[PDB]
Amino acid sequence: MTDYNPNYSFAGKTSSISDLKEVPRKNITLIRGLGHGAFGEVYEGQVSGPSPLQVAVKTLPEVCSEQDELDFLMEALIISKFNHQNIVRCIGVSLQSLPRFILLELMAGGDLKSFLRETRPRPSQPSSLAMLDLLHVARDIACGCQYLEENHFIHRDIAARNCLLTCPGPGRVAKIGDFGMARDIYRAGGCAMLPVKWMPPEAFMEGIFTSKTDTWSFGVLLWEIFSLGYMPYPSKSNQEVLEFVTSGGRMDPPKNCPGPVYRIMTQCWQHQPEDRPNFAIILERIEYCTQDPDVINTALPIE
């Protein structure tokens, strides 16, 4: 990490490893493993100087290559330089002890896909979620995407699995947490691991990426949200989706999805990038849906 010592640039400023805030290892205590390993080897932790700071701790297995090490460092740099409420904060790092740690804002609600799946309405918990909850999650992530767009950062992998919630209950805030794809790109894995079902046509055809490619992905995220955590294009394979979407195919509305919300999805999925909304427009249309009583009084389906 010191032998290659990569620099990272965001918003015109250049940073290096030496700019990360090193937290002494003795101040860090691991409490428990977290989640099913979506975001990697992640633990709930405590940082103290009492009233200790609660954190997520991402670890780097010591049995990783020197390039995994570099990926890890770059991931830390990227997330440390963001400054927005809908992007997970980086508390600091602990790189001078092994295994290496990145310290992250603790998102007690877990990842958005799992949350949607586990908090689906069911006969026992009839009103676990409401349409307004979903629109608020959508707004939250759109707000983070707008921040990235304004700072000319293309995320390349906007998807529910890469978003997290602060807490499970009312008052939850959704945030973008994973930046691995953008990391891999900034440092450039294989064809079968690409997020095909979240990618626009010109991503395949020409490999051209812009903020309008995040707009497309956000449309798919909206479908994930309002379907309550379903896999996009259910029962289609990656190559089937690639051929479907290229030929103009689009997903049907999620069950009970209000028309005004589905129309945001279809606008996000315009074949021509220039016909897709930027995230300021997406935010406007989400807000409009939020104001519409017929939208927010639509009942979600029961599982």
Ligand X SMILES: Cc1cc(-c2cc(NC(=O)c3ccc(CN4CCN(C)CC4)cc3)[nH]n2)ccc1N
**Which residues sit at the interface with ligand X, rule CB under 6 A?**
34-35, 39-40, 42, 56, 58, 79, 88, 104-110, 115, 118, 164, 168, 177-178
Report whether 243 belongs to an annotated binding site: no
Question: What are the residue ranges of helices labelled H in the chain?
Answer: 66-81, 112-118, 131-150, 180-186, 201-205, 211-226, 238-246, 259-268, 279-291, 293-296
**Rounded (5°) CA angle 54-56-86:** 95
Is 106 annotated in some ligand binding site?
yes
CB of 233 to ligand X, least distance (A): 25
**Does residue 36 have a known ligand-binding role?**
yes
From 157, 214, 292, 294, active-site residue: 157
Q: How far is CA 171 from CA 153, 168, 185, in A?
A: 28, 8, 34
Does the annotation list 105 as a binding residue?
yes
* CA proximity to 179, closest of 164, 191, 162: 162
CB of 22 to ligand X, least distance (A): 18
Check if the beta carbon of residue 159 is closer than 8 Å to that of residue 221.
Answer: yes
Which one, of 109, 111, 78, lies nearest residue 93 by Cα? 78
In Å, how far are 153, 221, 286 from 201, measured between CA atoms?
Answer: 20, 16, 24
Nearer to ligand X, 88 or 264 (CB): 88
What would the two tokens of residue 299 be? 């009942």
42 or 242: CB nearest ligand X: 42
Task: Tell me whether residue 12 or residue 37 sits nearer to ligand X (CB atom).
Answer: 37
Instruction: Confirm whether 157 is a catalytic residue.
Output: yes
Closest separation in Å from C-beta 119 to ligand X: 6
Between 164 and 257, whose beta carbon lies closer to ligand X? 164
- Could you give phi then psi for residue 146, rounded to 5 degrees? -60, -45
Minimal distance in Å, beta carbon 65 to ligand X? 19
Least separation, in Å, of the C-beta of 178 and ligand X?
Answer: 5
Q: Which two tokens stand for residue 64?
A: 């990783």
Binding residue per annotation — 107? yes
Q: Which is nearer to ligand X, 68 or 118 (CB)?
A: 118
CA distance 91 to 132: 31
Residues annotated within a binding site for ATP: 36, 58, 105-107, 178
Residue list, annotated binding site: 36, 58, 105-107, 178
Q: What residues are labeled active site?
A: 157
